[PDB]
Coordinates of C-alpha atoms and ligand atoms in Angstrom, one line a residue:
Chain A
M7 CA -0.1 -0.2 0.0
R8 CA 0.8 3.7 -0.4
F9 CA 0.1 6.3 2.3
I10 CA 1.1 9.8 2.4
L11 CA 1.9 10.6 5.9
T12 CA 1.8 14.4 6.9
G13 CA 1.8 16.4 10.3
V14 CA 2.8 19.8 11.6
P15 CA 6.2 21.3 11.1
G16 CA 8.7 20.1 13.3
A17 CA 6.6 18.1 15.7
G18 CA 8.1 14.6 15.1
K19 CA 7.3 13.7 11.7
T20 CA 10.6 13.0 10.5
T21 CA 11.4 10.7 13.3
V22 CA 8.5 9.0 12.7
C23 CA 9.5 8.1 9.1
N24 CA 13.0 6.9 10.2
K25 CA 11.6 4.6 12.9
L26 CA 9.5 3.5 10.6
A27 CA 11.9 2.5 8.1
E28 CA 14.7 1.0 10.9
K29 CA 11.7 -1.1 12.1
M30 CA 10.0 -2.3 8.9
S31 CA 12.0 -3.9 6.1
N32 CA 9.2 -4.4 3.6
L33 CA 8.7 -0.7 3.6
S34 CA 10.4 2.3 1.4
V35 CA 10.4 5.8 3.1
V36 CA 10.4 8.8 1.4
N37 CA 10.5 12.8 2.0
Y38 CA 9.2 14.2 -1.1
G39 CA 10.9 17.5 -0.4
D40 CA 14.5 15.9 -0.4
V41 CA 13.2 13.9 -3.8
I42 CA 12.8 17.3 -5.3
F43 CA 15.8 19.0 -4.3
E44 CA 17.9 16.2 -5.5
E45 CA 15.8 15.9 -9.1
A46 CA 16.6 19.4 -9.1
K47 CA 20.1 19.7 -8.2
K48 CA 20.5 17.0 -11.3
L49 CA 18.9 19.2 -13.7
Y50 CA 20.3 22.9 -12.5
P51 CA 23.3 21.9 -10.8
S52 CA 24.0 26.1 -10.8
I53 CA 21.5 27.1 -8.8
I54 CA 20.4 24.3 -6.3
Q55 CA 23.4 22.8 -4.0
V56 CA 21.0 22.7 -0.6
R57 CA 18.0 21.8 0.1
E58 CA 16.4 25.7 0.4
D59 CA 17.8 26.6 -2.9
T60 CA 14.3 25.1 -4.1
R61 CA 12.6 27.9 -3.3
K62 CA 14.9 29.8 -6.4
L63 CA 13.2 28.4 -9.2
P64 CA 11.0 29.7 -12.2
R65 CA 7.4 28.4 -11.8
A66 CA 7.6 26.2 -15.1
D67 CA 10.6 24.5 -13.7
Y68 CA 9.6 23.5 -10.2
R69 CA 6.3 22.2 -11.3
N70 CA 8.3 19.9 -13.8
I71 CA 10.0 19.1 -10.4
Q72 CA 7.2 18.3 -8.5
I73 CA 5.8 15.7 -11.6
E74 CA 9.3 14.5 -11.9
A75 CA 9.6 13.4 -8.5
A76 CA 6.4 11.8 -8.1
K77 CA 7.4 9.7 -11.5
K78 CA 10.5 8.7 -9.6
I79 CA 8.3 7.8 -6.2
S80 CA 6.2 5.9 -8.2
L81 CA 8.6 3.1 -9.7
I82 CA 8.8 1.9 -5.9
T83 CA 7.0 -1.5 -6.1
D84 CA 6.7 -2.7 -2.1
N85 CA 4.8 -0.8 0.7
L86 CA 5.7 3.0 0.6
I87 CA 5.4 6.1 3.2
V88 CA 5.5 9.6 1.3
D89 CA 6.7 12.1 3.8
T90 CA 5.4 15.7 2.9
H91 CA 2.9 18.2 4.5
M92 CA -0.8 18.9 3.6
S93 CA -0.6 22.7 3.6
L94 CA 1.9 25.6 3.9
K95 CA 1.1 28.6 5.4
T96 CA 2.5 31.7 4.2
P97 CA 1.8 35.6 4.4
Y98 CA -1.3 35.0 2.0
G99 CA -2.6 32.2 3.9
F100 CA -2.7 28.4 4.0
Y101 CA -1.5 26.9 0.5
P102 CA -2.2 23.4 -0.3
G103 CA 0.7 21.2 0.5
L104 CA 0.1 18.5 -3.1
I105 CA -0.2 19.3 -6.5
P106 CA -3.3 16.8 -7.6
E107 CA -0.5 15.7 -10.7
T108 CA 1.2 14.5 -7.4
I109 CA -1.8 12.3 -6.2
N110 CA -2.5 11.4 -9.6
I111 CA 0.7 9.6 -10.4
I112 CA 1.8 8.2 -7.1
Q113 CA -2.0 7.0 -6.4
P114 CA -1.9 6.8 -2.6
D115 CA -4.0 4.6 -0.8
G116 CA -4.6 6.8 1.8
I117 CA -3.5 10.1 3.9
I118 CA -2.0 9.8 7.2
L119 CA -2.1 13.0 9.8
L120 CA -0.1 12.9 13.1
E121 CA -1.9 15.4 15.4
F122 CA -0.5 16.9 18.3
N123 CA -0.7 18.7 21.4
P124 CA 0.3 22.4 20.4
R125 CA 2.5 22.9 23.6
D126 CA 4.2 19.6 22.6
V127 CA 5.1 21.0 19.0
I128 CA 6.3 24.4 20.4
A129 CA 8.6 22.1 22.8
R130 CA 9.9 20.2 19.8
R131 CA 10.7 22.7 18.0
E132 CA 12.7 24.7 20.8
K133 CA 14.5 21.1 21.4
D134 CA 15.7 20.5 18.0
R135 CA 16.7 24.3 18.1
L136 CA 18.9 23.0 21.0
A137 CA 20.6 20.3 19.1
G138 CA 21.5 22.3 16.2
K139 CA 18.5 21.5 13.7
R140 CA 17.2 24.4 13.0
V141 CA 18.8 28.1 13.5
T142 CA 16.2 30.6 14.7
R143 CA 13.4 30.6 17.7
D144 CA 10.2 29.5 16.5
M145 CA 7.7 31.8 17.4
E146 CA 4.0 30.2 16.7
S147 CA 1.7 30.6 19.2
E148 CA -0.8 27.3 20.6
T149 CA -3.4 28.6 18.3
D150 CA -1.6 29.2 15.1
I151 CA -0.3 25.5 15.5
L152 CA -4.2 24.3 16.2
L153 CA -5.5 26.1 12.9
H154 CA -2.8 24.4 10.9
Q155 CA -3.9 21.5 12.3
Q156 CA -7.4 22.0 11.7
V157 CA -6.7 23.2 8.2
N158 CA -4.6 20.2 7.4
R159 CA -7.8 17.5 8.3
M160 CA -9.9 19.6 6.1
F161 CA -7.6 19.6 3.1
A162 CA -7.2 15.7 3.6
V163 CA -10.8 15.0 3.6
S164 CA -11.4 17.6 0.3
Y165 CA -8.4 15.5 -1.7
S166 CA -10.5 12.3 -0.4
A167 CA -13.3 13.2 -1.6
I168 CA -11.8 14.3 -4.9
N169 CA -9.7 11.0 -5.5
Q170 CA -11.4 8.8 -2.8
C171 CA -8.5 7.6 -0.2
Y172 CA -8.3 6.9 3.4
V173 CA -8.3 9.7 5.7
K174 CA -6.2 8.1 9.1
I175 CA -5.7 10.7 12.3
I176 CA -3.1 9.4 14.5
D177 CA -4.3 11.1 17.9
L178 CA -0.4 11.8 19.5
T179 CA -2.7 14.5 21.5
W180 CA -1.9 12.9 25.0
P181 CA 0.6 13.2 27.4
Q182 CA 3.9 11.2 27.1
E183 CA 4.5 9.4 30.1
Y184 CA 8.5 8.6 28.6
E185 CA 10.3 10.3 26.0
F186 CA 9.5 9.0 22.5
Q187 CA 6.3 7.6 23.2
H188 CA 4.7 9.3 20.6
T189 CA 6.9 8.2 18.2
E190 CA 6.8 4.8 19.0
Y191 CA 3.2 5.0 19.2
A192 CA 2.6 6.4 15.6
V193 CA 5.5 4.0 14.6
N194 CA 3.5 0.7 15.8
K195 CA 0.2 2.3 14.8
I196 CA 1.0 2.8 11.0
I197 CA 3.3 -0.8 10.9
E198 CA 0.0 -2.4 12.3
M199 CA -2.2 -0.7 9.7
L200 CA 0.0 -1.4 6.7
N201 CA 0.1 -5.5 8.0
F202 CA -3.6 -5.6 8.4
Chain B
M28 CA -36.4 16.8 -4.8
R29 CA -33.1 14.2 -4.2
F30 CA -31.2 13.9 -0.7
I31 CA -28.4 11.9 0.1
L32 CA -29.1 11.3 4.3
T33 CA -25.8 10.7 6.4
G34 CA -25.3 10.1 9.8
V35 CA -22.8 8.3 11.7
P36 CA -23.9 4.1 12.0
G37 CA -26.2 2.8 14.7
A38 CA -27.8 6.4 16.1
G39 CA -31.3 6.5 14.7
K40 CA -30.8 7.4 10.8
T41 CA -32.0 3.8 9.8
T42 CA -35.1 4.6 11.7
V43 CA -35.6 8.1 10.2
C44 CA -35.4 6.2 6.7
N45 CA -37.9 3.5 7.6
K46 CA -40.8 6.4 8.9
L47 CA -39.7 9.0 6.0
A48 CA -40.5 5.5 4.1
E49 CA -44.0 4.7 5.5
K50 CA -45.1 8.3 6.1
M51 CA -44.2 10.3 2.4
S52 CA -46.4 9.7 -1.0
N53 CA -44.8 10.3 -4.4
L54 CA -41.2 9.2 -2.7
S55 CA -38.7 6.5 -2.6
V56 CA -36.6 5.8 0.2
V57 CA -33.9 3.7 -0.6
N58 CA -30.3 1.9 1.2
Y59 CA -27.6 2.4 -1.0
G60 CA -25.9 -0.4 0.4
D61 CA -28.8 -2.8 0.2
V62 CA -28.7 -1.6 -3.8
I63 CA -24.9 -2.7 -4.2
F64 CA -25.6 -6.0 -2.1
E65 CA -28.5 -6.7 -4.7
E66 CA -26.3 -5.3 -7.6
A67 CA -22.9 -7.7 -6.1
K68 CA -25.6 -11.0 -5.8
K69 CA -26.2 -10.6 -9.6
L70 CA -23.0 -9.8 -11.3
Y71 CA -21.1 -12.0 -8.5
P72 CA -23.5 -15.3 -7.5
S73 CA -20.3 -17.3 -6.6
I74 CA -18.5 -14.8 -4.1
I75 CA -21.5 -12.9 -3.1
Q76 CA -23.8 -14.5 -0.6
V77 CA -23.7 -11.9 2.4
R78 CA -24.0 -8.4 2.2
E79 CA -20.6 -8.6 4.1
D80 CA -19.1 -10.6 1.1
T81 CA -18.5 -6.9 -0.6
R82 CA -15.3 -6.6 1.3
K83 CA -14.1 -9.9 -1.2
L84 CA -14.5 -8.2 -4.5
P85 CA -11.5 -6.3 -6.1
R86 CA -11.6 -3.0 -5.3
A87 CA -12.9 -2.0 -9.6
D88 CA -15.3 -4.4 -9.3
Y89 CA -16.9 -2.7 -6.2
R90 CA -16.6 0.5 -8.0
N91 CA -18.2 -0.8 -11.0
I92 CA -21.1 -2.1 -8.5
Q93 CA -21.0 1.3 -7.1
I94 CA -21.9 2.5 -10.2
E95 CA -24.6 0.2 -11.2
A96 CA -26.3 0.7 -8.3
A97 CA -26.3 4.5 -8.7
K98 CA -27.8 3.8 -12.1
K99 CA -30.6 1.6 -10.6
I100 CA -31.4 4.1 -7.7
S101 CA -31.5 7.0 -10.4
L102 CA -34.2 5.2 -12.3
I103 CA -36.6 4.1 -9.0
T104 CA -38.7 7.2 -9.5
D105 CA -38.2 11.2 -9.4
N106 CA -38.3 11.9 -5.5
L107 CA -35.5 10.3 -3.7
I108 CA -33.8 9.6 -0.2
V109 CA -30.7 7.6 -0.5
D110 CA -29.7 6.1 3.1
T111 CA -25.9 6.3 2.8
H112 CA -22.9 7.7 4.6
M113 CA -20.3 10.5 3.8
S114 CA -17.6 7.8 5.5
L115 CA -17.2 4.7 7.3
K116 CA -13.9 4.2 9.8
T117 CA -11.5 0.9 8.9
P118 CA -8.3 0.2 9.9
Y119 CA -6.8 2.5 7.4
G120 CA -8.8 5.7 8.2
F121 CA -12.1 7.0 7.1
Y122 CA -13.2 6.0 3.8
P123 CA -16.3 8.0 1.8
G124 CA -19.1 5.8 1.3
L125 CA -20.0 7.7 -2.4
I126 CA -18.1 7.9 -5.6
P127 CA -17.9 11.0 -8.2
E128 CA -20.3 9.0 -10.0
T129 CA -22.7 8.5 -7.4
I130 CA -23.3 12.2 -7.7
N131 CA -23.2 12.4 -11.1
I132 CA -25.8 9.6 -11.9
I133 CA -28.0 10.6 -9.0
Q134 CA -27.8 14.5 -9.0
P135 CA -29.0 15.3 -5.8
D136 CA -30.3 18.4 -4.5
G137 CA -28.1 18.1 -1.1
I138 CA -27.2 16.0 1.6
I139 CA -28.5 15.5 5.2
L140 CA -26.9 14.9 8.2
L141 CA -28.1 14.1 11.1
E142 CA -26.1 14.6 14.0
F143 CA -26.1 13.4 17.8
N144 CA -25.0 13.8 20.9
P145 CA -22.3 11.1 21.4
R146 CA -23.6 10.2 24.5
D147 CA -26.9 9.3 23.2
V148 CA -25.2 7.2 20.2
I149 CA -23.4 5.5 22.8
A150 CA -26.3 4.4 24.9
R151 CA -28.1 3.8 21.4
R152 CA -25.6 1.1 20.3
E153 CA -25.6 -0.6 23.1
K154 CA -29.6 -1.2 23.4
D155 CA -29.6 -2.0 19.6
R156 CA -26.9 -4.7 20.5
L157 CA -28.6 -6.2 23.8
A158 CA -31.6 -6.7 21.4
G159 CA -30.1 -7.9 18.4
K160 CA -29.9 -5.4 15.8
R161 CA -26.7 -3.8 15.9
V162 CA -23.6 -5.9 15.6
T163 CA -21.0 -3.5 15.2
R164 CA -18.5 -5.0 17.9
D165 CA -15.8 -2.1 18.3
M166 CA -17.4 0.2 21.0
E167 CA -15.9 3.9 20.5
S168 CA -15.4 6.8 22.6
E169 CA -16.9 10.0 22.8
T170 CA -14.8 11.4 21.1
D171 CA -14.2 8.9 18.6
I172 CA -17.7 9.5 17.6
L173 CA -17.0 13.3 17.9
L174 CA -14.3 13.1 15.2
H175 CA -16.3 11.2 12.5
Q176 CA -19.1 13.3 12.9
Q177 CA -16.8 16.3 12.2
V178 CA -15.3 14.7 9.4
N179 CA -18.6 13.7 7.8
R180 CA -19.2 17.1 7.9
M181 CA -16.4 18.0 6.1
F182 CA -17.0 15.5 3.5
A183 CA -20.3 17.2 2.6
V184 CA -19.1 20.1 2.5
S185 CA -16.7 19.5 0.0
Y186 CA -19.5 17.6 -1.9
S187 CA -21.3 20.8 -1.9
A188 CA -18.3 22.6 -3.1
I189 CA -17.2 20.1 -5.7
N190 CA -21.2 19.6 -7.4
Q191 CA -23.3 22.9 -6.2
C192 CA -25.5 20.8 -3.7
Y193 CA -27.4 21.7 -0.6
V194 CA -25.6 20.9 3.0
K195 CA -28.4 20.3 5.4
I196 CA -27.1 19.6 9.2
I197 CA -29.9 18.5 11.4
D198 CA -29.2 19.0 15.2
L199 CA -30.3 16.0 17.3
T200 CA -28.0 16.7 20.1
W201 CA -30.0 18.2 22.4
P202 CA -31.4 15.9 25.5
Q203 CA -34.7 14.4 24.7
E204 CA -37.8 14.7 26.8
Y205 CA -39.4 11.5 25.8
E206 CA -38.0 8.0 23.8
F207 CA -37.7 8.7 19.9
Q208 CA -38.3 12.2 20.2
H209 CA -34.9 12.8 18.0
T210 CA -36.3 10.5 15.0
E211 CA -40.0 12.1 15.1
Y212 CA -37.7 15.9 14.7
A213 CA -36.2 14.5 12.2
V214 CA -38.7 12.8 10.3
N215 CA -41.0 15.9 10.5
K216 CA -38.1 18.5 9.6
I217 CA -37.3 16.4 6.5
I218 CA -41.0 16.5 5.2
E219 CA -41.4 19.9 6.2
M220 CA -38.4 20.4 4.0
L221 CA -39.6 18.4 1.0
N222 CA -43.0 20.0 1.0
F223 CA -41.8 24.1 1.5
Chain C
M10 CA -3.5 40.9 -7.2
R11 CA -6.7 39.3 -6.3
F12 CA -8.9 38.1 -3.0
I13 CA -12.6 36.8 -2.4
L14 CA -13.1 38.1 1.1
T15 CA -16.3 36.5 3.0
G16 CA -17.3 36.2 6.5
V17 CA -20.7 35.6 7.9
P18 CA -23.5 38.3 7.2
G19 CA -23.9 41.6 9.0
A20 CA -20.7 41.2 11.2
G21 CA -19.0 43.8 10.0
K22 CA -17.8 42.8 6.7
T23 CA -18.9 45.8 4.7
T24 CA -17.3 48.1 7.0
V25 CA -13.8 46.4 6.2
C26 CA -14.7 46.9 2.6
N27 CA -15.5 50.4 2.9
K28 CA -12.5 51.0 5.0
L29 CA -10.1 49.2 2.4
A30 CA -11.5 50.9 -0.2
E31 CA -11.0 54.6 1.4
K32 CA -8.1 54.0 2.7
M33 CA -6.3 52.3 -0.4
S34 CA -6.4 54.1 -3.4
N35 CA -5.1 52.0 -6.0
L36 CA -7.8 48.9 -4.8
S37 CA -11.1 48.3 -6.3
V38 CA -13.6 46.9 -4.3
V39 CA -16.4 45.0 -5.8
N40 CA -19.1 43.8 -4.2
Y41 CA -20.6 40.6 -6.2
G42 CA -24.0 40.1 -4.9
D43 CA -24.3 44.0 -6.4
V44 CA -23.0 42.9 -10.0
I45 CA -25.4 40.1 -10.1
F46 CA -28.3 42.3 -9.4
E47 CA -27.1 44.9 -12.4
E48 CA -27.1 42.1 -14.5
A49 CA -30.2 40.6 -13.4
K50 CA -31.9 44.6 -14.1
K51 CA -30.2 44.6 -17.3
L52 CA -31.3 40.8 -18.9
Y53 CA -34.5 40.9 -17.1
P54 CA -35.9 44.4 -16.6
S55 CA -39.4 43.9 -15.8
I56 CA -38.9 40.9 -13.5
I57 CA -36.2 42.0 -11.8
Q58 CA -36.9 45.1 -9.7
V59 CA -35.4 44.6 -6.2
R60 CA -32.3 41.5 -5.1
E61 CA -34.5 39.1 -3.6
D62 CA -36.0 38.7 -7.0
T63 CA -33.6 37.0 -8.6
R64 CA -34.7 34.1 -6.7
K65 CA -37.7 33.4 -8.8
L66 CA -35.3 33.0 -11.9
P67 CA -34.6 29.6 -14.0
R68 CA -31.2 28.1 -12.4
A69 CA -29.9 28.3 -16.1
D70 CA -30.6 31.8 -15.9
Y71 CA -29.2 32.9 -12.6
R72 CA -26.3 31.0 -13.8
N73 CA -25.6 33.2 -16.7
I74 CA -25.9 36.1 -15.1
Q75 CA -23.5 34.9 -12.1
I76 CA -20.5 34.2 -15.1
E77 CA -21.8 37.2 -16.9
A78 CA -21.1 39.5 -13.6
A79 CA -17.8 37.6 -13.1
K80 CA -16.7 38.6 -16.5
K81 CA -17.6 41.8 -15.9
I82 CA -15.0 41.7 -12.7
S83 CA -11.8 39.6 -14.4
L84 CA -11.7 42.9 -16.2
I85 CA -10.5 44.8 -13.8
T86 CA -6.8 45.4 -13.4
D87 CA -4.5 46.3 -10.4
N88 CA -5.0 45.3 -7.1
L89 CA -9.0 43.9 -6.3
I90 CA -10.9 42.5 -3.5
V91 CA -14.6 40.5 -4.0
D92 CA -16.8 40.9 -1.8
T93 CA -18.7 37.5 -1.5
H94 CA -20.5 34.9 0.7
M95 CA -18.6 31.3 1.0
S96 CA -22.2 29.9 1.5
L97 CA -25.8 31.0 2.9
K98 CA -28.5 29.2 5.0
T99 CA -31.7 28.3 3.1
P100 CA -34.6 26.0 4.1
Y101 CA -32.7 23.2 2.4
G102 CA -29.4 23.8 4.3
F103 CA -26.4 25.6 3.3
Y104 CA -26.1 26.5 -0.5
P105 CA -22.1 28.0 -1.5
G106 CA -22.4 31.4 -2.9
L107 CA -19.9 31.3 -5.9
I108 CA -20.2 28.7 -8.6
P109 CA -17.0 27.2 -10.3
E110 CA -16.9 29.2 -13.1
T111 CA -16.6 32.5 -10.7
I112 CA -13.9 31.3 -9.5
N113 CA -12.1 30.1 -13.1
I114 CA -12.8 33.3 -14.6
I115 CA -12.0 35.7 -11.7
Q116 CA -9.2 33.5 -11.0
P117 CA -8.1 34.6 -7.2
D118 CA -5.1 34.5 -5.7
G119 CA -7.0 33.3 -2.8
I120 CA -10.0 33.6 -0.3
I121 CA -9.9 35.8 2.9
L122 CA -12.2 34.3 5.9
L123 CA -13.3 37.0 8.6
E124 CA -13.9 35.2 11.8
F125 CA -15.9 36.6 14.6
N126 CA -16.8 35.5 18.1
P127 CA -21.0 34.8 17.6
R128 CA -22.0 37.0 20.0
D129 CA -19.9 40.3 18.6
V130 CA -22.1 39.4 15.8
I131 CA -25.4 38.9 17.0
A132 CA -24.8 42.2 18.5
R133 CA -23.8 44.0 15.1
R134 CA -26.9 42.6 13.5
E135 CA -28.6 44.2 16.2
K136 CA -27.3 47.3 15.8
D137 CA -28.7 47.0 12.5
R138 CA -32.4 45.6 12.3
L139 CA -33.4 47.8 15.4
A140 CA -32.6 50.4 12.6
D141 CA -34.8 36.0 13.5
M142 CA -32.1 36.4 15.5
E143 CA -29.5 33.0 15.1
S144 CA -28.2 31.8 18.0
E145 CA -24.5 31.6 18.8
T146 CA -24.5 27.9 18.4
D147 CA -26.1 28.6 14.7
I148 CA -23.6 31.4 13.3
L149 CA -20.6 29.2 15.3
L150 CA -21.8 26.4 12.2
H151 CA -21.9 28.7 9.6
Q152 CA -18.4 30.0 10.5
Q153 CA -17.3 26.6 10.4
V154 CA -19.0 25.3 7.3
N155 CA -17.3 28.5 5.4
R156 CA -13.7 27.6 6.7
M157 CA -14.5 23.9 4.8
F158 CA -16.0 25.6 1.7
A159 CA -13.2 28.2 1.7
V160 CA -10.3 24.8 2.4
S161 CA -12.0 23.0 -0.4
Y162 CA -12.1 25.4 -3.2
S163 CA -8.5 25.6 -2.1
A164 CA -7.6 21.9 -3.0
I165 CA -9.4 22.4 -6.2
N166 CA -8.3 25.4 -7.4
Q167 CA -4.9 25.2 -5.9
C168 CA -5.0 29.2 -4.2
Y169 CA -4.7 30.5 -1.0
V170 CA -6.9 30.4 2.3
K171 CA -6.3 33.2 4.9
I172 CA -8.0 32.8 8.0
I173 CA -7.8 36.2 9.8
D174 CA -9.1 36.1 13.8
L175 CA -11.7 38.7 14.9
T176 CA -12.5 36.5 17.8
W177 CA -10.8 38.3 20.4
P178 CA -12.6 40.7 22.9
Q179 CA -12.4 44.6 21.4
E180 CA -10.7 46.6 23.7
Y181 CA -12.2 49.6 22.3
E182 CA -14.7 50.5 19.2
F183 CA -13.6 49.4 15.9
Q184 CA -11.0 47.6 16.7
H185 CA -11.5 44.5 14.8
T186 CA -12.5 46.2 11.4
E187 CA -9.6 48.5 12.1
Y188 CA -7.1 45.2 12.3
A189 CA -8.9 43.3 9.6
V190 CA -8.6 46.1 7.5
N191 CA -4.4 46.9 8.1
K192 CA -4.0 42.9 8.0
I193 CA -5.4 42.9 4.3
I194 CA -3.1 46.1 3.3
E195 CA -0.1 44.4 4.4
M196 CA -1.3 41.4 2.5
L197 CA -1.4 43.6 -1.0
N198 CA 1.7 45.3 0.1
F199 CA 3.8 42.1 0.6
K200 CA 7.2 41.1 -1.8
Ligands
CL315 CL1 9.6 16.3 12.4
CL316 CL1 -29.8 3.7 13.2
CL317 CL1 -21.3 43.7 7.6

């Protein structure tokens, strides 16, 4: 089966992905943005040296990279999880995170949403900073993060209404008793789904 | 007029549909799942014997059954109440009950959502389980039921944005003053709508 | 840039439209419903005399009016705000205010949703009625449905959806209106 895996930024989605790939050998885990960067660096070596250089491309060029990355991903034949985002926040508001072409090509069975308590997102973002993984203190409010998660749920349901796919919401909003518990719980739920 | 009538499983929607079917002239009340089962048995007598057997068909064959069933329904008569669901919960997540071909073929004027208080759904499911009517073993929490009702709301509005149809939300979340008041209230709001 | 601006009726959206048009010279602010009624009178003049007269028309005739109105608006050059409704409540339920052709023709960069505390909506409605009231729970429902419509259109049309939170308590009069006006100007002047 094929699932898109989503969640607000910096909340633990990467860790879930890495843990899934460590645990299940019957599974390929890919990060869409990384595949986009790699395919872009192949075609535009002069402009794209690091993942964030993707912002510099002209629209006609960026769109064709997303399509090409999706085609590359769709060559995978066993279980697949694609790490990406339901929406991005910009000054103009939220913008959908999947182009319809991406879904037409990958043909996901469903969308998985990791939903957190916004305080845990603020804290994870700051811990990632103290470990080096990001330069500036994130200043999103609990309110802004909740809004994002609500909007993401609506995007996922809309994509399901359009394309007929599962919408799997994984509740990680409860308090952790021990460290890594949210991540461990999500990984096991995804594995059990895949092996059902 | 033609309306798709929906709500979470086992909460009273079937009773509303049975009462509409007895009380309204010039109107057919029909259950999409029933037609699907009947068409499935017509075309696959070897595999389809119990209505659970639909689960064993390849998804492409199940979809073609859903098209055939919508075609049968649209031919029945002019005014229709189509009892079905916006989504059902599965091990892979919520999955839409309709396909686009359903709405294209039936051309509903709108979607009706019967919305219940989760505590009343829990009690009603257990009452019906004890009486031998409801046999959906898994017991859901209050928060599970509210999430389902929210997702159903999102599917219905998505379908309206795509197909320009009404979204009618019937609030049955207040406490009943006598047994079966919710059913009677919902029936009369629907009849009042159909004769406006 | 072009945005559709929406919110539940009677909550202050018109005031925001007026003050935007007044505080920004290079901006056109158009009310879709007004253009629709204009085109309706011009095509059905003996039948159409006030705006609620358009509910009498065959749906295909109404739709053609909606399309003609969108074409007229799509000619406006420079920044533009189109004041309209994601949905209205009817006896048959909520019904979308736009048709897909409206978005297709205007090609908005995005949708802007103004969101209010329900009791502030009730208050404003009375201050213009005195001159049947929905409950707080009705208005909340209407706002949640509008959000769902806007996100759906965003997914279908690949456009922005901006939510302007005006649910906090006003510390002085006019503060909600001023805040939304300024957030939208800030948006139109972004680089
Ligand atoms: Cl992460
Ligand atoms: Cl029932
Ligand atoms: Cl107003």
